[PDB]
């Protein structure tokens, strides 16, 4: 049963080349059609191109001067290369299969990857400053402030606390993002047992833990 994974850098400078990989498992790229799709901010989806089962590529004409899609059949991977990027290329990038027998002839993308974010900017990375928010049920928080670019990933107790969590969308202000996250637990679990927020910012190679201590 197919799975698709997009991978590649999260931050690239204008004029440089964006290079992404789709790694396909549970199926083989020598059958069907293997597509790249991106979504700009404001939910604008764009079909960029594909590579066929025999290795022929099709490119959206407006991208043809900059784009190439190639593959490695022996590793079941296919690749997107986009040259000479600008801020207009900031998007979430998806790979998708058109292989399922019943649908292939109706030009549907029958299985999609999760997508991967790419930001195109000349700005340096800024890691988040992570601050603990301590005070029947008790609500605790983490303030994840002043980072660039998106995304960050926030977890609680390394993923073991997943219920009762709200992670608020990041907002851009003075050229940096800030978000916060809350977690609600029974009063009889904290502080007797520890609660820690974990924040990963892969663009700056940072991952930190902040224990919530009573004040």
């Amino acid at each position: 049963e197919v799975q698709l994974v997009e991978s590649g850098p999260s931050l690239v400078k204008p004029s440089q080349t964006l290079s992404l990989t789709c790694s396909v498992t549970g199926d083989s790229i020598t059958s069907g059609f293997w597509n790249w799709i991106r979504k700009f901010p404001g939910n604008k989806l764009e079909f960029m191109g594909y590579i066929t089962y025999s290795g022929t590529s099709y490119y959206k004409p407006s991208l043809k001067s900059r784009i190439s899609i190639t593959r490695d059949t022996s590793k079941n991977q296919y690749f997107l290369q986009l040259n000479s990027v600008t801020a207009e290329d900031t998007a979430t990038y998806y790979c998708a299969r058109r292989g399922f027998l019943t649908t292939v002839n109706y030009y549907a993308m029958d299985y999609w990857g999760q997508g991967t974010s790419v930001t195109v900017s000349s700005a340096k990375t800024t890691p988040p400053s992570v601050y603990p928010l301590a005070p029947s049920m008790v609500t605790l928080g983490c303030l994840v402030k002043g980072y660039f670019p998106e995304p960050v990933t926030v977890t609680w107790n390394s993923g073991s606390l997943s219920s009762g969590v709200h992670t608020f969308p990041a907002v851009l202000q003075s050229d940096l993002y800030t978000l916060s996250s809350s977690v609600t637990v029974p009063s009889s679990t904290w502080p007797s047992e520890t609660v820690t927020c974990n924040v990963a910012h892969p663009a700056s190679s940072t991952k930190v833990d902040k224990k919530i201590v009573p004040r």
Partner: protein, 211 residues
């Protein structure tokens, strides 16, 4: 290229209601019209292909109809898990093109927020900043008005507010409101209050601490 228009970008309906989402193409697309669902976590799934055919595994509550330029996706009875954004896609002519999406939100009974307030952390204060944070969690409807007061008077600026997407399990919303000052400004005042007005009470929600 074929322009696909979803004129309605958002819809709100009750559990059990029937809803229709519609797509108009710039040309005759000969029934090559597919529909996708993207849930708030970002996962994209094929629901309907070739106007009206259900993709393997999709519930029969979904159907589709249309011809020429005009196509519809219909959900017979809305369910909690249908909170998502729905996109059309033409498959008549390359490059494939998509509608702008229609975000579907599901009504639920009104629900009062649970409110929490947090003074600046000692670590942030060591750096020279002072963010005061109020969470207003698990409420409905989404519209909520938050104001900050410092020593009893409204403070309009330095406030940043962010709402969650609608929770796919309970249909509530949550929001954060952060007042950011410098340490020096924070230390000039004693009382910090976040006050929210919401349709679930005639009194404001008031949560305060003294520095």
């Amino acid at each position: 290229d074929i322009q696909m228009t979803q004129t309605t970008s958002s819809l709100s309906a009750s559990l059990g209601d029937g809803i229709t989402i519609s797509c108009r193409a710039s040309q005759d697309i000969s029934n090559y019209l597919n529909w996708y669902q993207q849930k708030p976590d970002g996962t994209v799934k094929l629901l309907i292909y070739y106007t009206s055919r259900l993709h393997s595994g999709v519930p029969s509550r979904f159907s589709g109809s249309g011809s020429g330029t005009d196509y519809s996706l219909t959900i017979s009875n809305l369910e909690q898990e249908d909170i998502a954004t729905y996109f059309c896609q033409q498959g008549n002519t390359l490059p494939y093109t998509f509608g702008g999406g229609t975000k579907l939100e599901i009504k639920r009974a009104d629900a009062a927020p649970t409110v929490s307030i947090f003074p600046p952390s000692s670590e942030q204060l060591t750096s020279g900043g002072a963010s005061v944070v109020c969470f207003l969690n698990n409420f409905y409807p989404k519209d909520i008005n938050v104001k900050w007061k410092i020593d009893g008077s409204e403070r309009q600026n330095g406030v940043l507010n962010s709402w969650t997407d609608q929770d796919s399990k309970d249909s509530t919303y949550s929001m954060s409101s952060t007042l950011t000052l410098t340490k020096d400004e924070y230390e000039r005042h004693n009382s910090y209050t976040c006050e929210a007005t919401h349709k679930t009470s005639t009194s404001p929600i008031v949560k305060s601490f003294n520095r």
